[PDB]
Design goal:
The complex is a heterotetramer.
Chain B: E1 5-13, E2 16-23, E3 26-29, H1 37-46, E4 52-56, E5 102-105, H2 106-109, E6 111-116, E7 123-130, E8 133-137, H3 144-154, E9 160-163, E10 175-177, E11 209-213, E12 219-227, E13 230-237, E14 240-244, H4 251-260, E15 266-268, E16 283-285, E17 303-304, E18 316-319
Parallel strand pairs in B: 8-10, 14-16
Antiparallel strand pairs in B: 1-2, 2-3, 2-5, 4-5, 6-7, 7-8, 7-11, 9-11, 12-13, 13-14, 13-18, 15-18, 16-17
Chain C: H1 5-15, H2 23-34, H3 51-56, H4 58-75, H5 81-84, H6 86-95, H7 101-118, H8 124-141
Helix pairs in contact in C: 1-8, 2-4, 2-7, 7-8
Chain D: E1 25-30, E2 35-40, E3 45-48, H1 50-53, H2 63-66, E4 70-74, E5 78-79, E6 82-87, E7 97-101, E8 127-132, E9 146-151, H3 155-162, E10 187-190, E11 207-212, E12 217-226, E13 236-240, H4 245-253
Antiparallel strand pairs in D: 1-2, 1-4, 2-3, 3-7, 4-5, 6-7, 8-9, 8-11, 10-13, 11-12, 12-13
Classes of the chains: A mainly alpha, B mainly beta, C mainly alpha, D mainly beta.
The structure holds protoporphyrin IX containing FE (HEM) (2 copies), 2-acetamido-2-deoxy-beta-D-glucopyranose (3 copies) and calcium ion (2 copies).
Site (Not glycated) (chain A): 11, 56, 60, 90, 99
Modified residues (Phosphotyrosine) (chain A): 24
Modified residues (N6-acetyllysine) (chain A): 16
Amino acid sequence: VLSPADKTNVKAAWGKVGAHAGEYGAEALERMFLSFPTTKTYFPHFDLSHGSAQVKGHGKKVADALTNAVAHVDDMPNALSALSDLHAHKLRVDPVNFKLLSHCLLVTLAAHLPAEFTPAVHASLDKFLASVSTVLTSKYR
Amino acid sequence: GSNLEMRLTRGGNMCSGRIEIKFQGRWGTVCDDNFNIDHASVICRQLECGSAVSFSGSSNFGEGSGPIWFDDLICNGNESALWNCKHQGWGKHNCDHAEDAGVICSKGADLSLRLVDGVTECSGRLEVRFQGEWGTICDDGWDSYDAAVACKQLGCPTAVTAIGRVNASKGFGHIWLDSVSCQGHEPAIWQCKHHEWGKHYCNHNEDAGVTCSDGSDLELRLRGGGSRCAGTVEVEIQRLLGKVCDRGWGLKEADVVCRQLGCGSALKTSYQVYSKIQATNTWLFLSSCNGNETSLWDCKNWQWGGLTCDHYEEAKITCSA
Amino acid sequence: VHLTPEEKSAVTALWGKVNVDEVGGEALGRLLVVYPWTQRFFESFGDLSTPDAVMGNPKVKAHGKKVLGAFSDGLAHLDNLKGTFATLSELHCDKLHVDPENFRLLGNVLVCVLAHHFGKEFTPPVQAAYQKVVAGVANALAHKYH
Amino acid sequence: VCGKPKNPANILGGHLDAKGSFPWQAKMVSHHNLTTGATLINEQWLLTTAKNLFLNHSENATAKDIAPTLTLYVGKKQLVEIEKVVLHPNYSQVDIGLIKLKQKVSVNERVMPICLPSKDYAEVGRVGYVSGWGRNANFKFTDHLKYVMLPVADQDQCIRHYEGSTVPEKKTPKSPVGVQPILNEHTFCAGMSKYQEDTCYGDAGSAFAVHDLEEDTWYATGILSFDKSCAVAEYGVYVKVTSIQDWVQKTIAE
Ligand code: HEM
Ligand code: HEM
Ligand SMILES: *[C@@H]1O[C@H](CO)[C@@H](O)[C@H](O)[C@H]1NC(C)=O
Ligand SMILES: *[C@@H]1O[C@H](CO)[C@@H](O)[C@H](O)[C@H]1NC(C)=O
Ligand SMILES: *[C@@H]1O[C@H](CO)[C@@H](O)[C@H](O)[C@H]1NC(C)=O
Ligand SMILES: [Ca+2]
Ligand SMILES: [Ca+2]
């Protein structure tokens, strides 16, 4: 997928969200940790609780990576190449968990973006996050 | 002889499109490898279509079909025909059909620039007429050299050039140019570097605008802090009042403002209660000053209007004096 | 699966506020837009081609109203969910051969629509409880492929 | 008998194989719990990809290393023991392995090999069926076998979709995914369906089965090689079986 209309809409939404991105990333992570507790075992050295500075920081990192990806949306394999290497080889993240995190990110956006979550923009953001997950899981072995 | 014909196909008119050459009754294309403005100048000359404006690979006109007739051309732009340029021979190429060159000439393009919905004839949203229709430019990469080129083309003062849309609505329809990057010497905006025509990700919330001024009308004042040197930072540009957004607002910018009023340095971005100072809809964004500028207007790439901030706004300063 | 009393209270207290004539159509429409292969099962619904057309299709709204009616019935019988959903499982599995992954998928769309409609009230614990509910409903509904 | 399924047909997609219609599909699971596909081609042999066989392993591994670490299922839940594995002597252009079973599998309604084709069926526009045990939209291994209908795509369109140019010395990686597919004369490409369904992680090793209505016979036209063609890239890439038929007959004879 990833048509031109989808790319315009996802860029519009990302850019309006702006610097709140890290806050929404952290909220999405907390939602994921509480709703899908199996995912917690990849973060044993974190303290996992609401308001954790460590979770806030990691969610800010993830959001910044997503904004980089949107800023380089047509050359995404190279832009996310390092993170894909890290996620497959060092962390050995099961691919299902990217679908879980992506869903929780979408739910966070829905819960905080009343007007900006039309069906078309929902679909474009879903496809964008599915594409990021696809790239970050393409080197699984 | 007279058995060589050339035409442009799919560019909406006879003076724009992919290059197709008929040889022995078969049409074929030319690759954009080493393709350049001298070749386009030759092509636009062959159609009596005026000067060359743009060349592009198979992106603006779609992929062609058939033979690639010419590749790695070396010709000076004064040649009487494109098939008179130096070539390695018919059907010798390294290109694929993704490299099919296309051109747009001035008689098939028709460009003019105007400002719309300005406070004056030298401010407003920038619109380009292309093939009879007006459209805007997205501000992705839109800088002060581009604004300076636009102001120069309108014959407006270029001493101070702001980007952005003051009272200008969001455009509609086509965005014709994207990532305009001028050096400031170009005679027209469409001679600067830009992306391929019509290929963009921008939306009509991103529209380039300009404000051209001689500097005699730009005013800066502090209001509502009990003196002229403390309060919300109010600006008056072309007799339009607005406020500076706090996004990117630091002590360096505050020190620039304090310096313009001759009050020494900025001591606090604190809150004090004096008067009421009404709210407005037009914002000045500062990306950064070095702090050694003599005027806020000397900071580079400052944006006047064109963007809406969140609840955080209305940067205020209290200086010592 | 066993919901505790505070989770059951959370779920039913939120559910009392749901508009049962609209939210199911909203979720089904969003499912059809975001995951377009599901249109295969709705051939009789006519034009499924644009977001406005899906969301405005009265048959989509009516069917989503039925789907949410079934969700509400499951929400009222959190302990005997298997018998409640036996006939719906027979319908969706033996006659239509819908892959059971789509019950989970539709559940996640429904969670997103509830998040969009209720905003800040859809807190992380409420989401977790709804995820437990919808997972249990999906697993119950897929029982006949076993 | 080859290519005579009892119930002929009318992956993150749709079309659950509810009535059972692909008796040549096998599901192999590796020692570290990954499910991929394989295709029974006679009573004792199956086709799969080299990459599938090299999972869980270092980029240096032999046949005797791989053979004891595999688990193989046919039909619905019948475990079948593997005798040996024969990798194709080439892997830079062909991505194929043959699996030999210790005993002959019993042939019935649920387990039957697909027939090997004598014609080249890979003409542009032909819609084939790909069955698979791979991951669904949630990137979880599917609970039931599924299939999709995909059309064969234009080879040059595919080359441009993955690589900068079709000219060798002008090529640059342009793969919308991280891992690059193998493209050469031994392979063909295939676009997704029209309700936007395609193959994804774990489908490799499955057959591009074509149903020839003239003979009412199912033929393995391709073996899915590049299974990363998830809804992000456009085309899956398959190894042409016609280009390995002779090698298959030879390996079977020996
Ligand atoms: C779209 C999905 C995701 C994106 C874009 C993403 C992005 C990132 C980024 C930017 C980092 C830090 C890299 C660095 O500091 O150099 C990271 C680290 C990590 N990620 Fe993800 N992440 C995603 C989902 C996940 C999920 C769901 C898991 C596990 C369930 C995971 C596992 C890890 C681990 C274990 C680390 C190491 C943490 C560290 O080194 O501090 N990732 N990820
Ligand atoms: C996920 C939970 C779902 C539940 C609890 C549910 C429940 C229902 C209900 C209450 C009906 C109406 C039966 C009647 O009026 O007698 C129905 C019919 C139907 N269901 Fe669902 N539904 C669900 C999801 C789906 C999905 C995901 C699909 C397709 C992918 C689907 C396909 C259909 C169709 C096509 C009908 C109408 C068949 C007809 O009218 O002949 N449903 N289901
Ligand atoms: C802003 O408002 C209108 C409409 O854009 C414009 O005509 C006017 O000149 C602007 N304001 C002032 C104070 O001139
Ligand atoms: C995972 O692998 C282990 C070791 O072979 C096995 O005991 C277990 O059942 C596997 N789990 C799944 C879900 O396949
Ligand atoms: C393996 O590659 C070599 C070198 O290209 C080639 O001669 C040989 O035929 C290939 N193997 C087979 C079985 O075709
Ligand atoms: Ca060349
Ligand atoms: Ca510029």
